[PDB]
Structures are given as C-alpha cells and as structure tokens.
Design a protein around this ligand. Structure first.
Ligand SMILES: NC(=O)c1ccc[n+]([C@@H]2O[C@H](COP(=O)([O-])OP(=O)(O)OC[C@H]3O[C@@H](n4cnc5c(N)ncnc54)[C@H](OP(=O)(O)O)[C@@H]3O)[C@@H](O)[C@H]2O)c1
Ligand SMILES: [Mn+2]
Length: 723
C-alpha cells in the first residue's frame, strides 16, 4: 500500500489533477494507493470531532501515518504541508466556522479548564506538527542526473554578484543560542530535571526528561537585552548604508522561540507605537508576536485607530526601507510571522542579485538580519564567495547531495516542548536522578531558554548513510560541524567514534565548521565536481533550499529519500514547501506555475521501494517518461496564457503510457497511450483556454471538492480518458 499525502495550497491543488492520473496507472497495474488528509484544515477537523456532524469528521491521519512509519514496511509519498503560524491557524479556524464546521475559537487566555485543554490541542497543531512525527529516519536529498542535466541544458538566472554588491548578513555577537550553548553525551540512562530559581520568588520545575544511553542533550538561551540592542544596531546600520531592512527567521517550525524573536523585531522597529499605545494595544489584545496584520485587524475598533496609523507613517519615515512580501497590498516582512522563512527567503534574495523589494516594488540591496550566528555564517560565506567569484553558473556547477540528521525529532526540531520564556531574573539549573548539577545559566526576564535531544541510533545511522553514499559515488563528504559549539564538538567525538567501526580506505571526508564547509563546497562545485554535505537537522533544511535553488531554480526538483529505521520508506516530493504564492496566481488568473516534477520522482522511488514485478516495470518506464518530459521541456511556465501544472500532468501521462506500450504490460496501456497521443492538441487547448480568469475554489485551507476538481480538471476529453 502506497499512501499519497493530501496537504495544503499549491501541492493540494496539483493533487486534484495528478492523483486521478497516478491512480488510473497504478490501478491498471493492480498497485494499491490511497490519500491521507494531513492538510491544516483536516488536522484541525480530526482534532475537534465532538464539535462536528458525522460527514464533517476526519480520521487522525497524522496518528495513522505516525504508526505506519514504525511498521516493518511503509511506503509514504509526502508532499509539502503547512507548519502553521497562529495567524494561519486563526484564519483556518475562521474559514471552517464560516462553512458550518463548528470548531472552537483559539482562546489566547483560557477562562476555564475547558478553554485550557482547547488551547493545548491547537498548540500541538501549530508549527511543524507532521514532519517531526513522520521523520522516523534520516534524509538523503540530491538531484537525479536527468534533473541536473535539465538545469545545465536549460539554465535559470542566478542574477549578478561583484565586490560592488553591498548585500550583507547581520547576526548577534554574544547573547545568542550559539554563544550560551552547553552540551553533554550521556553514557547511561538518567532522568533530568529543569528548575527555575528567581532571585526573588519560589523555585519551579519547568521540565522532566527521560534521557537514554548515548543521547546528546544541549541547553542554551538568547538574551532579550542583547537581542534588543542588536535589533536597534541592525536597524541603524540599515539606515546608514541605505540597505533595505529584511528579517529571516523560522517562526513556523521554531513555534516557541521565533514568534518571540519576531515580536522583538516588531516592538523594536515600531518602538514609538508600542510606547504611545502600550495600554491601548494591551487592552485590544495585541501580541506583537503575531505581526502587523493581527495588530491592524485589532485596531479596526479603537478610538485611537487613525492616531495609531499616523504614528506608523512617522516611524516608516525615520526608519530604513522595510522588505515587502507584497508591495501592492502594503504587506511587510513584519505583517505575518510565516511569510518570510529563512530557508526559502535567503536564496530567493541571493538569486535576485542580493536585491529584495520596497514599498514601490523597487529591487534594492538588502541587509539580511539573522539573529543567531550558528547558521547565519553559512549565508555570510555564500555571500563572500559570490562577491569574490561572481554568481554560481547553473550550466557549469556540480551538485550538492545532503545527508541530514533528522530521526526522532533531532536537535532544534524537537526543542519546542523544551523551550521556555524566563518569567523574571533568576537562574536555570538542570539535574539528573543522582542530583548532579549538569547545566546552570544566569538568565533574565524575557530570555529564551532552550534544550535539545539527539539520540545515538539517529547519529549512528546518519554516519552509515554518508559513508555508504560516498562509497557508492566516490564524492568528497564534508561533515558541517563547528568545534566552537558544544553540541557540534560532541557530534565530532560521536562521528569519530562511529567511523572507527568502518574501513576509511576510499572514504574521502573532511570535518569543517559551516563557514569553511560552505567555501569548500562552493570551490568544489565551481570546478564542476559533485560534493556531499553531512549536516544537522537545520542545515539539512537550509542547504537543500540554498544549493538546489541556485543549481535547479526551486528545491522542489530534488529527490528526498527517508529510509525509516524500522525498514519503511518515506519519499518527499522535493525539499520545498507548499508555495502559497502559486495559489494567489491560480485564484486571480487560473494559472498554476507549481512544478510537480518532484511528485513524479518521489513516485518513481516509491515504486522501486514497493519492488513488485509491476512496480519495477512502472518505475523504469516512469523514469524514461520523466527523462522525455525534461528533454521536451514540459515543466510548467509562469505567465497566464502559457502551459501550466495541468498541461505538464498531461505530457507526463502521454509519455508514461507511451513508455509502458514497449514493456511486458503493453496490451494494458495501448489504448491509453493512443487515446492521449490522438488527443494531444485537443486536450492541450481544453487546459490552456480556461486560463486568464479568476476562479472560485470554495475556500483556501479547505476547498469545495466539486469546484477544485472543476478548476484543476477542466478538460472533458482528458477526464473521459482518465476516468
Ligand atoms: N512540509 C515540508 O516539507 C515543508 C518544507 C518547507 C516549507 N513548508 C511550508 O510551506 C509553506 C511555504 O514555505 P516557504 O514560503 O518557506 O517556501 P516555499 O513553498 O518552498 O517557497 C515557494 C517559492 O519557491 C518556488 N517553489 C517552491 N516549490 C515549487 C514547485 N513545486 N514548483 C516550482 N517552484 C516552487 C517557488 O518560487 P516562485 O514564486 O518563484 O514561483 C515559490 O514561490 C509554509 O507553510 C511552510 O511551513 C513545508
Ligand atoms: Mn521552503
């Protein structure tokens, strides 16, 4: 059984067109496949059944697939899905209520234990709820030969870069998680205790943790005062040097830390509003953590509305130009916490000649504020090397493979339950079963305290993948590990320990700090050689947007293979997200520029993994079909009135069917091959000719299925072939 994930936004809409096609082909080969609704709307419905009519209820597909990942064999095609910010959860709740799905309001401040439990249910739904539960395995992300050869044959622009390019990252120097980090390997299984001790007040037990034999636990904090001084410093450096102010966080997955960090940026930039209106904004229930969008919604009803708006205008005037998400709608990099996400936002910036957009959609060289230095140094290096050697030439450069440590919520991706905001000046102490003081921190009011767990089987497995992949291909493999970080220093000892079990003859490997590892991998791919990155859970994410965007245009054209520790497979339809922007263009203009190429390729490896006589026949033929797809350049176009996602589904269908008539399954596919060849022009015209009008999908987070299929499946003659 293959499970296909129904998710959100762009891939959700693609799936309305592509799934019936996948389905037609697998059914005819007696291969079993279904969908699972892990959409943000579906997850919410599945979690509040007691509020719903029976036909409204949704199975807890997150729980079902979580179980499946631990089973001796599982086959999941995982499409990108929303890691919700609060403003997205609030918008999804609304959309459901308005449609008579009667789910409860988010209580910001619960009155009773009833409202307490409801806030805690929604809190589990916020942020990266799905990926950390499904990722019961480490990660292989790489560009298939045929996809790289497409990039080389059909090169995108990586813009223009020189010593005159004034684009720069800005990160804190002391005060950040990197500076304050401590770590410990645990040889024996002990139980930990995290207690706060305020210089006046009672002690408090913040957290209890089961630690197992082998686990690396770290602890750290960011200083609210260093953060606040750094934000002011970073704002005045922007204004001085005439750089556009841009802020790149992870307020999605980092669902406790990064909205808090994000709120300091909003309080910091607009400090005169949070001074003149401290009490009015409090009374209106304004949390700066939610962005300007929630603030402007909350001051619609305030006697001081216009006086608040004239104050913004006065601040914008004294301040450096703010990076915009949407210039036409006045939406800023500080309107909604989920809109600018570092992994996607920094490489779009780098490709566009280090330019981002201002109020008037003018492209302007940017200050890239990334508070923590741990990963900021990666973009610094990348930026240094673009200035020295010019842009990375997609037609010339070699390919970065990533072996990413993920399994069992490794490193900062399991930190949400272990992140706390310090109520008052005090100290954190952390103790074991015996009662030994393992960590201690002098912390202050507003300080962001955090810990992390990375276990031994995850680390041990992650080495085997990098070793085995390097023996397979001959490529150099760099472990990106900063000896100036305690967490990293513990991983070096653990890699070194584990490599003593392996024959290191043939295994070309270095260990470099992320800064140095970046210049070495850039140096290697300029020459045109392939290289392997062996990284942590966050670099896994950052690097498989960075290099893939530079080398292929979008990270969605990558393979993303997760060999689950219990022997299943999860295959992710690229290294990208749910591309909300593609949705805006589908609504307004009936053109989806979403490329499904990562879905095609996920499906190829899903079939190899199935490994049935027919699965291998459909895999080998689909691979040939995708090669033809890339040779004939069928990938969607961007402008309305040009062929889109739907047309590309058609061309893959035609090519797949054709390729299957050459195989032992030919008789089965002969009529489909002929019917799609003979209707090529008629079908392409049916799909094009609906483009250039706005469309009613009946929703955004939850579509009206009838309307979504009419928009995504608008070709009667393709439909009559496919069903
Ligand atoms: N579940 C996952 O694995 C995963 C991973 C990352 C992000 N997300 C989620 O996705 C949402 C958006 O995240 P984001 O804004 O960081 O990044 P995003 O969806 O990856 O960024 C989208 C931009 O990258 C290009 N792109 C991405 N996928 C593409 C595809 N299949 N075909 C063609 N171009 C593609 C597109 O650029 P153009 O505009 O130039 O066309 C798009 O605007 C968030 O809700 C986030 O939580 C999920
Ligand atoms: Mn992304």
């Amino acid at each position: 059984m293959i499970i296909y994930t129904y998710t959100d936004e762009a891939p959700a809409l693609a799936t309305y067109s592509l799934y019936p096609i996948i389905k037609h082909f697998l059914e005819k080969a007696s291969i079993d496949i279904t969908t699972a609704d892990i959409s943000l709307a579906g997850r919410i419905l599945a979690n509040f059944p007691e509020y719903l009519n029976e036909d409204q209820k949704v199975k807890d597909y997150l729980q079902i697939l979580g179980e499946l990942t631990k089973k001796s064999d599982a086959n999941i095609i995982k499409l990108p899905n929303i890691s919700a910010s609060l403003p997205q959860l609030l918008d999804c709740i609304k959309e459901l209520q308005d449609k008579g799905f009667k789910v409860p309001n988010y209580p910001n401040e619960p009155k009773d234990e009833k409202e307490r439990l409801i806030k805690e249910r929604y809190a589990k739904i916020l942020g990266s709820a799905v990926n950390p539960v499904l990722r019961e395995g480490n990660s292989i992300r790489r560009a298939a030969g045929a996809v790289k050869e497409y990039a080389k044959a059909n090169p995108h622009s990586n813009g223009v870069w020189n010593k005159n390019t004034k684009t720069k990252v800005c990160y804190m120097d002391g005060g950040d998680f990197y500076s304050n980090e401590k770590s410990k390997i645990f040889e024996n299984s002990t139980n930990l205790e995290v207690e706060f001790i305020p210089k006046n007040g009672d002690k408090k037990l913040l957290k209890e943790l089961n630690i197992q034999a082998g686990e690396v636990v770290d602890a750290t904090f960011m200083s609210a005062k260093k953060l606040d001084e750094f934000i002011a410093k970073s704002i005045d450096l922007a204004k001085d040097e005439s750089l556009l102010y841009s802020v790149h966080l992870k307020a999605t997955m980092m669902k406790v830390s990064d909205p808090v960090i994000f709120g300091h940026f909003v309080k910091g930039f607009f400090d005169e509003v949070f001074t003149e209106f401290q009490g009015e904004l409090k009374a209106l229930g304004v949390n700066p953590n939610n962005g300007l969008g929630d603030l402007f919604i909350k001051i619609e009803n305030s006697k001081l509305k216009d006086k608040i708006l004239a104050k913004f205008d006065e601040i914008y005037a004294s301040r450096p130009s703010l990076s915009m998400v949407n210039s036409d709608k006045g939406i800023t990099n500080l309107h909604v916490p989920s809109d600018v996400i570092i992994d996607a936002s920094m490489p779009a910036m780098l490709r566009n000649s280090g330019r981002l957009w201002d109020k008037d959609a003018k492209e302007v060289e940017a200050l890239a504020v990334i508070p923590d230095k741990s990963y900021a140094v990666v973009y610094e290096a990348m930026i240094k090397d673009l200035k020295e050697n010019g842009t990375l030439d997609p037609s010339q450069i070699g390919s970065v493979t990533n072996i990413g440590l993920m399994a069992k919520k490794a490193e900062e991706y399991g930190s949400h339950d272990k992140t706390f905001i310090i109520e008052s000046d005090g100290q954190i102490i952390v103790n074991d079963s015996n009662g030994e003081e393992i960590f201690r921190f002098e912390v202050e009011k507003g300080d962001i305290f955090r810990m992390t767990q990375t276990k031994s089987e995850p680390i041990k497995n992650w080495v085997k993948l990098a070793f085995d992949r390097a023996k397979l291909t001959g490529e150099k493999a760099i472990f990106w590990l900063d000896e100036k970080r305690a967490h990293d220093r513990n991983l070096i000892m653990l890699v070194k320990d584990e490599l003593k079990k392996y024959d290191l003859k043939g295994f070309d490997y270095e260990i470099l700090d992320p800064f140095s590892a970046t210049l070495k991998t850039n140096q290697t791919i300029r020459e045109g050689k392939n290289i392997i990155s062996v990284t942590g859970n966050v670099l896994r994410d950052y690097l498989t947007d960075l290099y893939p965007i530079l080398e292929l245009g979008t990270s969605a054209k990558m393979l993303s293979i997760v060999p689950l520790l219990n022997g299943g497979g999860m295959f992710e339809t690229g290294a990208g997200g749910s591309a909300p922007k593609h949705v805006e263009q589908l609504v307004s203009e009936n053109h989806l520029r979403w490329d499904s190429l990562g879905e095609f390729m996920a499906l190829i490896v899903s079939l190899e993994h199935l490994g049935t006589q027919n699965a291998k026949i459909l895999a080998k033929a689909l691979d040939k079909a995708v090669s033809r797809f890339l040779k004939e350049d069928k990938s969607p176009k961007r402008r309305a009135g040009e062929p889109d996602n739907r047309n590309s589904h058609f061309y893959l269908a035609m090519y797949f069917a054709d390729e299957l008539t050459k195989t032992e399954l030919g008789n089965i596919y002969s009529d489909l091959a002929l019917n799609l060849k003979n209707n090529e022009a008629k079908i392409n015209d049916e799909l094009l000719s609906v483009q250039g009008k706005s469309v009613d999908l009946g929703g955004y987070y939850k579509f009206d299925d009838e309307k979504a299929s009419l928009v995504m499946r608008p070709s009667k003659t393709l439909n009559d072939i496919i069903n």
